[PDB]
Amino acid sequence: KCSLTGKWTNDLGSNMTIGAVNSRGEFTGTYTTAVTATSNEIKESPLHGTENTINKRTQPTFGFTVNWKFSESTTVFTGQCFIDRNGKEVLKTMWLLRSSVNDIGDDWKATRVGINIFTRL
Amino acid sequence: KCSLTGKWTNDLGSNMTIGAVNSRGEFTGTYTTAVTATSNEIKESPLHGTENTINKRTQPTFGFTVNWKFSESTTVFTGQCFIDRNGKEVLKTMWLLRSSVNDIGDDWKATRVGINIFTRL
Amino acid sequence: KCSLTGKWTNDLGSNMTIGAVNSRGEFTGTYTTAVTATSNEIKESPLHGTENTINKRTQPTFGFTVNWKFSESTTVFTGQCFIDRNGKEVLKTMWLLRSSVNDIGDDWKATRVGINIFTRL
Amino acid sequence: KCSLTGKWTNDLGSNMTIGAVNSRGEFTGTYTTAVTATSNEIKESPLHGTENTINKRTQPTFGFTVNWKFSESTTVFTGQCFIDRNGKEVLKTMWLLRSSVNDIGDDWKATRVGINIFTRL
Ligand SMILES: Nc1nc(=O)c2ncn([C@H]3C[C@H](O)[C@@H](CO)O3)c2[nH]1
Ligand SMILES: Nc1nc(=O)c2ncn([C@H]3C[C@H](O)[C@@H](CO)O3)c2[nH]1
Ligand SMILES: *[C@@H]1O[C@H](CO)[C@@H](O)[C@H](O)[C@H]1NC(C)=O
Ligand SMILES: *[C@@H]1O[C@H](CO)[C@@H](O)[C@H](O)[C@H]1NC(C)=O
Ligand SMILES: *[C@@H]1O[C@H](CO)[C@@H](O)[C@H](O)[C@H]1NC(C)=O
Ligand SMILES: *[C@@H]1O[C@H](CO)[C@@H](O)[C@H](O)[C@H]1NC(C)=O
């Protein structure tokens, strides 16, 4: 009932497209953000993830990594695909954004955390 | 200099094997835990991820998703491959563990966070 | 311009009252939830925290700890008091929920993470 | 058996002192870090927290906020006081570091996450 395939937009205005999910639950996609004002446009970064196929849940958990094309950073997202109080699909996710640091002594401050909610575009 | 390919063990005793990383930074492997019980014995779950290839860093960031085979949960891990002060390779990671919930009203309690440090096996 | 003192409600329906903030940035208050059951009905737990007073910012950061009265758990919340784009006060927060575990070997799964957004009641 | 009162040091070399905990579980302390090389010394910031007193656990959960004196940031810590495989006390904590941002549009990148382990000084 809740399928990851398709076009999504989030609460900060980023968009993401996800292709077909195979029988192993693997999928690829693209992740688009602004930077920043009306002016001007965008960066596209690839994403790769898997949805959990245990018990063929109608609302499966999933995870994906975005391999940023314009920085040395990586973000991972994890969450669950829900049906809301009737019909519309919603991805409730949390993410970790990992910055590159040059010294292992700075490792402690390299990880940001937050949320995103996605709806169909 | 720090390469994800190979066998790793962490601070809680789980092991992980990662395969070759392709020119897009993509890799697959397997994640093994313990400590359930048995006279052994373990579970093996596949993982899929990407290493960031921007500026061909010697200590790249990376993320991967573990698609648990024995539960409806997903974990994502993000971190950086370092050469430590002592010259040995280490993966400093943080993870989010997403539990499946039945109602979107329980979404708030579905995410655990923690760390893992990996060294070569 | 954004002051923590007063009554707040969040996105999950919990309410919070915060008292006066003293010259050191210290405050006390109460945190109320739902949605257990009853014909009511609620639990009230005390909270204690500090607002950062450096540079007398109009949108200060702050943290507080809620000492749950009905469990062995603790939550900490950190965030910033903003004047939103629409001119209304909002607390954008993130929290960690620490569960009590009996063995130090289960420490790895004792921490949940999430967000809460508060507006004036 | 595990009491928060006393002098502690962590895995990054920060120290913290915590005073007496009252009957409500409230405590104050001081949090000291370096910045950075042998040269030279330190900053001291106050801390305020509470330990959970439910079921008078020998290994209670606790939380505290550090109100940084040299920045507009706030950190909160939550964790549990353990006795380890015999006699020595250990605080296993996780933290959220909240940076001040000027626009609510940057709120999403304002929170870092990590761990600290403390032992008696
Ligand atoms: N080793 C290890 N380190 C982690 O950080 C971690 N985070 C989650 N998990 C796995 C464990 C269960 O398979 C599974 C429980 O569904 O979650 C982890 N395992
Ligand atoms: N409203 C609200 N928002 C949170 O982010 C949050 N995080 C933790 N908790 C509280 C709820 C239970 O009292 C208690 C369960 O021990 O944890 C929260 N309550
Ligand atoms: C997301 O998609 C819509 C088009 O449907 C567009 O208006 C907007 O510019 C997009 N946002 C980004 C970050 O590209
Ligand atoms: C990890 O590998 C080592 C072999 O070096 C083995 O002793 C250990 O039991 C393995 N752990 C798991 C969880 O399989
Ligand atoms: C929060 O306060 C409002 C009154 O504005 C009340 O309707 C609601 O039930 C309260 N929630 C809780 C959890 O007490
Ligand atoms: C912590 O305490 C010890 C003294 O016991 C000292 O060597 C060290 O400088 C301290 N570290 C900091 C950050 O002050």
CA–CA–CA angle A68, A12, B75 (5° rounding): 55
Best of D27, D52, D83, D86 to mutate (most C CBs within 10 Å, chain C): D52
Residues 6+ apart with CB under 8 A from D81: D2, D3, D4, D51, D59, D60, D62, D89, D90, D91
C chain contacts of residue D24, beta-carbon cutoff 8 Å? 46
User: Could you tell me if A2 and A21 are in contact, meaning their C-beta atoms sit under 8 angstroms apart?
Assistant: no
Q: How far apart are CA C80 and CA C1, in angstroms?
A: 12
E strand spans, D20-73:
26-33, 43-51, 61-67
The finding on whether A14 has its CB within 6 A of some atom of ligand 3 is yes
Alpha-carbon B88 to chain mean position: 19
Stated in angstroms to one decimal place, the resolution of this structure is: 2.0
Q: To which residue do tokens 């829900």 refer? A: A82
Q: Count the Cβ atoms, other than its own, within 10 Å of residue C27.
A: 20
> In order of start, what are the domains of chain D with their CATH numbers?
1-121 (2.40.128.30)
- B53: nearest Cα among C21, C26, C74, A74: A74
Choose, out of D2, D43, D54, the residue to mutate when testing the contact with C (most C CBs < 10 Å). Answer: D54
Look at the block and give the residue holding tokens 């077909």: A20
User: For residue C53, how far is the Cα from the chain centroid?
Assistant: 18
Residue C20 counted as an annotated binding residue: no
